[PDB]
Amino acid sequence: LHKEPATLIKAIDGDTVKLMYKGQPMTFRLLLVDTPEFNEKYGPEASAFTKKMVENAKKIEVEFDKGQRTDKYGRGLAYQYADGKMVNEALVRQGLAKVAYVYKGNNTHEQLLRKAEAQAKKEKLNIWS
Ligand SMILES: Cc1cn([C@H]2C[C@H](OP(=O)(O)O)[C@@H](COP(=O)(O)O)O2)c(=O)[nH]c1=O
Numbered sequence: 001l002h003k004e005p006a007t008l009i010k011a012i013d014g015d016t017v018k019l020m021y022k023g024q025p026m027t028f029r030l031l032l033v034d035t036p037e038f039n040e041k042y043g044p045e046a047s048a049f050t051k052k053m054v055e056n057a058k059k060i061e062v063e064f065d066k067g068q069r070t071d072k073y074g075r076g077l078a079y080q081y082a083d084g085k086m087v088n089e090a091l092v093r094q095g096l097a098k099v100a101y102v103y104k105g106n107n108t109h110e111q112l113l114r115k116a117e118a119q120a121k122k123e124k125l126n127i128w129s
């Protein structure tokens, strides 16, 4: 897989961010994770975590996987990097997202994210507490 440039337009919630990608505004949904909705327990914490990570980054990148690049809502499906740190992994490692929505062909980083989840769970962090 390959990282490509994007710039932040606006944080939205724990697992969706508005980015400008090839010059066009798009809502991106993070691959392989599910954060609580803002109205649910840990939802505001997930939103805050992703907001801080993308707003503080000097460089955001998106990385598409091998399969579908947009979902049925027209959201981009990618892994997101903030100064080289994967947002998807960081949320899972902090117990603010569960690994989820693991569809065949878009699952390159599944085992990396499962390993982070196992660690967050061993630590009883957030959702796992
Ligand atoms: C993460 C992800 C979500 N989706 C769709 C499945 C779910 O459909 P439904 O809306 O019918 O439940 C929805 C979940 O996204 P959210 O967690 O953002 O609600 O997005 C994909 O199709 N592919 C993906 O990789």
Ligand SMILES: [Ca+2]
Residues within 6 Å of the ligand: 015, 034, 035, 036, 037
């Ligand atoms: Ca969600």
